[PDB]
Structure formats: structure tokens, C-alpha cells
Ligand binder design. Structure first.
Ligand SMILES: [Zn+2]
Ligand SMILES: [Zn+2]
Ligand SMILES: [Zn+2]
Lengths: 115, 46, 260, 67, 124
């Protein structure tokens, strides 16, 4: 009667942007990234990778409503740095980490099956 | 057009037209069931 | 400001589960990997049923739901098939779906067990796991003499976010800091609690001394497979899926940055 | 009415274990040992097999609608 | 199919509607990846004093781990909480039915060890 289709958690609606960047006016060098059709899976890793950047002053995320299917990630960096650049570098670092983890898991599987 | 029904007691496929008392021709039982439609109903296995 | 250099150590690899350890990674990465095991590792499962005849004691949606939860071998085919969203065909085609047929009739006096062995596929690679060449076959329905079940299913590509039938795991044990050194738990009576299988403590010692400078490292995993994928295929597909989620996010990020 | 396919909690397949479970029980296994023989180690799957009531066997005592 | 707003009840007067449904990766999990089918609020216990709910949960954990059916007949001196706890401690569990759970969203351990186990629920 009121059950949303299960794909609405993963699929973007037509004309709906995957990610939107909005300047935070309260403090300088801060941005809000509203990412649609993602959840804690990417939010937590992006936040925790951003916390590894010493040029990042704030890194947090929230799912504003569990029934809704977006996350907001707030990133504040030092003045010489940018929150967009920080977010990009965090994603790049996560991708490199996962590539290395995948190659090493392939090697470990090969060793385990062989000996 | 035929509207074949099944008997509740003898399970016999028998045709009955409108304005006809509901009686199985094989055993006279008074309760009949319609057969499953031929239309194509789809289920999402969820 | 840069990526981790995680290492891996697989401590057990069977056809049923994989038990491994990831070290030198963040807890968020470990838990996102754990979540992707459950919710973003695609597999093949029946997601469309057409009941041509069902004289069984279970109604049509019961049979359909029951067929959807039968695991189908998805190892090499799931990467090749497309989502029906992405397929440029009609409702179905062999590029985005797999056809199954089931046609059973109980004529004999003993009860006929309509099992997953009766799910006949057009694709030899995508078959019910129990039907793969021990464990018995999954029971779809029991039929009495004169009862009959004839249906036509189509299996699709999906993951556990959409429905648990596309979840490839039969349990994902995840653990870290087996000895409570980070004190992320606070036992009122630490002596009362059993020791983890990964604990390295003498029996007199209940929990490790508190580590003020500690961070969660060395996450232990036991990924049990429902049958569709091999456990190591579940882990590899999870890592690839998480990496493609991040890559797509970065692509959209670049479009948003350059459009500003 | 019939043995579920998956364990509600973890999603382990239990549909193929009901008949084997009954065969082990008539083989003079205890329910715990039978559940151990089938590889149900989490108490959720043990719940699934141990608390199941096979009502379909009673529904098959009624003649079908068509012969 | 059960949904938000459907009424469920245990056998102890503990009724309530489904507030929300989380997927298995969003629910909290034990070290062996068991997620709860249902999560009920601890504040429903103290005023109500439905200790039978807790004893049934603990007895049910013992029953599921032992392969038996628990005897909850009302006035039975051969079955008390200490015996059930001693039985549960033999299966590698905290004797009082608590377990370390992990946050499904972040994977971090929950500081307070949660009371979890099989309980018979009813859909109304
Ligand atoms: Zn008749
Ligand atoms: Zn197609
Ligand atoms: Zn289970």
C-alpha cells in the first residue's frame, strides 16, 4: 500500500544527482556533500579516510532518515586545502587500499589452495 | 463459453450452462468449483 | 593522509566458508567490506515466476517466494549477466536473465517431493546449488497423488540491498580485538565471559590490559557461503563492488566539481 | 507449513535438512546430535530445524480438488 | 508481508508495532554473525516486570544450543534461572544470556553487552 520498491535504496531517480556539493557558510572551508542512494557503507569509509588527512579539520556523515536513501558528509579542511580536494583524495585512497586488499586476497587464496 | 466446473466430491470436470441447477452429472453433488484461469499471473519471488 | 596498506592472512578455505584476517586497515573499511558481503555482492536468484498449474497445498505466492530463496550457482555468470535495468531487450533475454522450468505431477501413491532438483535451467552454468554435482536437495513442495505443479521462472541479477534472496552469505562472523584491549566493550564482570576463539590470553587472565594508544586493527572474518558463490568469490566480488561504488562516486564527484 | 528454505536470521539453507533431520531422529540420534550432524552450529539454524512443525503432512491428508 | 505498523507480541504481554525494518547489514551482530530477528526496547521490561520474557529468552538459547524444548511449566522447582544459566555457560555463552554485539552501521562493538536469544513471538 505504501511499501517503496526495494530498488529505490540503490537506484537514482531520473534527474536526481548522485552527489551535490553545497558550501557551508557557518565556518570557512567547509562543504556538505549530499550523496543520494548511498548509506553507511560508503559514508563510514569516506568519513574515516577523511579523518586520516591532517588537513581535514572536520569529517562527519549522517543518514538524516533511515527511510530516506541519502547521506550527508560534512568536510572542513585547513584554509590551504579544500573539502572537495579532501573528498577526492579520500576516495582515491580508499580505491587504492581496496585494490591492494583485493590483490593480496587473491595472492592469499592462491597460496591457500596451492599450499 | 463452456464454463466447466469441478465436483467437490467426485472431482469430475463437467460443463454447466447458465440457468441450470448446480448439479454434478456423475454423482449429483451440489457444490462445484471453478477451474484455475488461463490468464497469465506473474509473481516476483519476494 | 593516504591509504592503508592492509595485509591478508587466510586461516581456512573450504567450499562452505572462508576464514581470514585483515590487518592494518580501518574499522570503517572492515565493516564496509563486511556489509558488502551481505548487501552488495550480486548473485543470480529467481525473481520472476509464472505458475501455469499448481494443485499443491501451498498457494502460488508461497511457491514463488520459496523458489526465489533457492540459491543458484552464480560464480562466473553473474559478472557476465546484466541487470534488466541495463539490458536493452524486452522483459527478458539470455543476456540479463536465466530461464528455469519446473513440471512435476504426483501420479504414484507415495508423496512426491518437488525439490530443487526439479528446477531445470536453460543455462547449464546457473543451476540450483544442491543440484550441482551428500547434501540433499532443497524441498519446494510435497505433492499428493493427483496434485501437480508446473511453472516457469526467470532468475535475475541482484544483491542483498534489494532482497535477502540475493544475499550470498549464510552468516558473516566479524570480530576484532578479541581480548578487550581497546575496551570498546566494558564487561561488568570480565571473568564471567567466555574467551574468543581468536584470543591469546592465559586462562587466569580475563581480558587484555587496556591499550590507551590502540586502534582497531586485525579484523577476523568468517564468510560462510549460501552456495551461489564460492566464499573467496564472495570476498573478491565484495572488494570489486566496493571499489566500483567508490569509482562511480568519484566520477560523479568530478562532474560536480568541474560543473561548478 | 513446510520447512523454510533459508534460516530467517543468517540465511543458511535449511530446506534440504528436514528430511535428513527426521531420518537422523529415527536413527536414534538426539535432536542436538542430529542438528550437529547436519552442520547447524548457530542456534538460529538449530531453532529453524528444532522448532519446525511439518503441517504440510497434515494438509496432504485431504484429497486434492482434481483427480 | 510484515511491515512498519504491524502489531507483534511475545507471550508475556509485551506487544508493540514495528517501528522500522533494517537489513541484515544494518542490524547489530554477534561475533558469530547472528543478527536479531527483532529488537525490543529494554524500557518495556522494568515497569511491566515480565521476567518470564527474560527467562524464556535464556531458556530458549539453552534449548536451541542443546537441541531440546525448554520446560517452562509454571511451578517447577527443577527449573530455575541459576540452572538455566549454568547450562548456557556450557555452550560457550555468557551465563546470563548477554553477548557482545557490534554496531551494524559502523562495526564497532557496543559498549553494553546486549541480552539476545530465541523468544517465541506472535504476529497479531
Ligand atoms: Zn460429482
Ligand atoms: Zn535482457
Ligand atoms: Zn541461521
Amino acid at each position: 500500500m505504501n511499501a517503496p520498491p526495494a530498488f529505490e535504496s540503490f537506484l537514482l531517480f531520473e534527474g536526481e544527482k548522485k552527489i551535490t556539493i553545497n558550501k557551508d557558510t557557518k565556518v570557512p572551508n567547509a562543504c556538505l556533500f549530499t550523496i543520494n542512494k548511498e548509506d553507511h557503507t560508503l559514508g563510514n569509509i569516506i568519513k574515516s579516510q577523511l579523518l586520516k588527512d591532517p588537513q581535514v579539520l572536520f569529517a562527519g556523515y549522517k543518514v538524516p532518515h533511515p527511510l530516506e536513501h541519502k547521506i550527508i558528509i560534512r568536510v572542513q579542511t585547513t584554509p590551504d586545502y579544500s573539502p572537495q580536494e579532501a573528498f577526492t583524495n579520500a576516495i582515491t585512497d580508499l580505491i587504492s587500499e581496496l585494490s591492494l586488499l583485493e590483490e593480496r586476497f587473491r595472492v592469499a587464496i592462491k597460496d591457500k589452495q596451492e599450499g | 463459453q463452456p464454463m466447466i466446473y469441478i465436483c467437490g466430491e467426485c472431482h469430475t470436470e463437467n460443463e454447466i450452462k447458465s440457468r441450470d441447477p448446480i448439479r454434478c452429472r456423475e454423482c449429483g453433488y451440489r457444490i462445484m468449483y471453478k477451474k484455475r484461469t488461463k490468464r497469465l499471473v506473474v509473481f516476483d519471488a519476494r | 593522509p593516504y591509504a592503508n596498506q592492509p595485509t591478508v592472512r587466510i586461516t581456512e578455505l573450504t567450499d562452505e566458508n572462508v576464514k581470514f584476517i585483515i590487518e592494518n586497515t580501518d574499522l570503517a573499511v572492515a565493516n564496509s567490506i563486511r556489509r558488502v558481503f551481505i548487501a552488495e555482492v550480486p548473485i543470480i536468484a529467481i525473481d520472476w515466476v509464472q505458475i501455469d498449474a499448481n494443485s499443491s497445498v501451498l498457494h502460488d505466492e508461497f511457491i514463488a517466494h520459496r523458489l526465489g530463496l533457492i540459491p543458484l550457482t552464480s560464480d562466473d555468470i553473474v559478472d557476465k549477466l546484466q541487470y534488466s535495468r541495463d539490458c536493452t531487450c524486452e522483459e527478458f533475454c539470455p543476456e540479463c536473465s536465466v530461464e528455469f522450468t519446473l513440471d512435476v505431477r504426483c501420479n504414484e501413491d507415495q508423496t512426491r517431493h518437488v525439490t530443487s532438483r526439479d528446477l531445470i535451467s536453460n543455462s547449464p552454468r546457473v543451476i540450483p546449488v544442491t543440484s550441482r554435482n551428500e547434501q540433499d536437495d532443497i524441498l519446494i513442495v510435497k505433492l499428493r497423488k493427483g496434485q501437480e505443479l508446473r511453472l516457469r521462472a526467470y532468475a535475475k541479477k541482484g544483491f542483498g540491498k534489494e532482497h535477502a534472496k540475493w544475499n550470498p552469505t549464510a552468516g558473516v562472523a566479524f570480530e576484532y580485538d578479541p581480548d578487550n584491549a581497546l575496551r570498546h566493550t566494558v564487561y561488568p564482570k570480565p571473568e564471567e565471559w567466555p574467551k574468543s576463539e581468536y584470543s591469546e590470553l592465559d586462562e587466569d587472565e580475563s581480558q587484555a590490559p587496556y591499550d590507551p594508544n590502540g586502534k582497531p586493527e586485525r579484523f577476523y572474518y568468517n564468510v560462510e557461503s549460501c552456495g551461489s558463490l564460492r566464499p573467496e568469490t564472495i570476498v573478491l566480488s565484495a572488494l570489486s563492488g566496493l571499489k566500483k561504488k567508490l569509482s562511480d562516486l568519484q566520477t560523479q564527484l568530478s562532474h560536480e566539481i568541474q560543473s561548478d | 507449513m513446510i520447512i523454510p528454505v533459508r534460516c530467517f536470521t543468517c540465511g543458511k539453507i535449511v530446506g534440504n535438512k528436514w528430511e535428513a533431520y527426521l531420518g537422523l531422529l529415527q536413527a536414534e540420534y538426539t535432536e542436538g546430535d542430529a542438528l550437529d550432524a547436519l552442520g547447524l552450529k548457530r542456534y538460529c539454524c538449530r531453532r529453524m530445524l528444532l522448532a519446525h512443525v511439518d503441517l504440510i503432512e497434515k494438509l496432504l491428508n485431504y484429497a486434492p480438488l482434481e483427480k | 508481508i510484515p511491515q512498519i505498523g504491524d502489531k507483534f507480541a511475545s507471550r508475556h504481554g509485551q506487544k508493540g508495532t514495528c517501528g522500522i525494518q533494517y537489513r541484515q547489514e544494518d542490524m547489530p551482530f554477534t561475533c558469530e554473525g547472528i543478527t536479531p530477528d527483532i529488537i525490543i526496547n529494554p524500557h518495556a521490561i522494568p515497569s511491566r516486570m515480565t521476567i518470564g520474557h527474560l527467562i524464556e529468552c535464556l531458556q530458549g538459547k539453552v534449548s536451541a544450543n542443546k537441541g531440546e524444548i525448554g520446560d517452562a511449566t509454571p511451578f517447577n522447582d527443577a527449573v530455575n534461572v541459576q540452572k538455566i544459566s549454568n547450562l548456557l555457560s556450557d555452550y560457550g555463552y555468557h551465563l546470563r544470556g548477554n553477548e557482545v554485539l557490534y554496531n551494524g552501521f559502523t562495526g564497532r562493538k557496543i559498549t553494553s553487552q546486549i541480552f539476545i536469544g530465541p523468544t517465541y513471538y506472535q504476529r497479531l
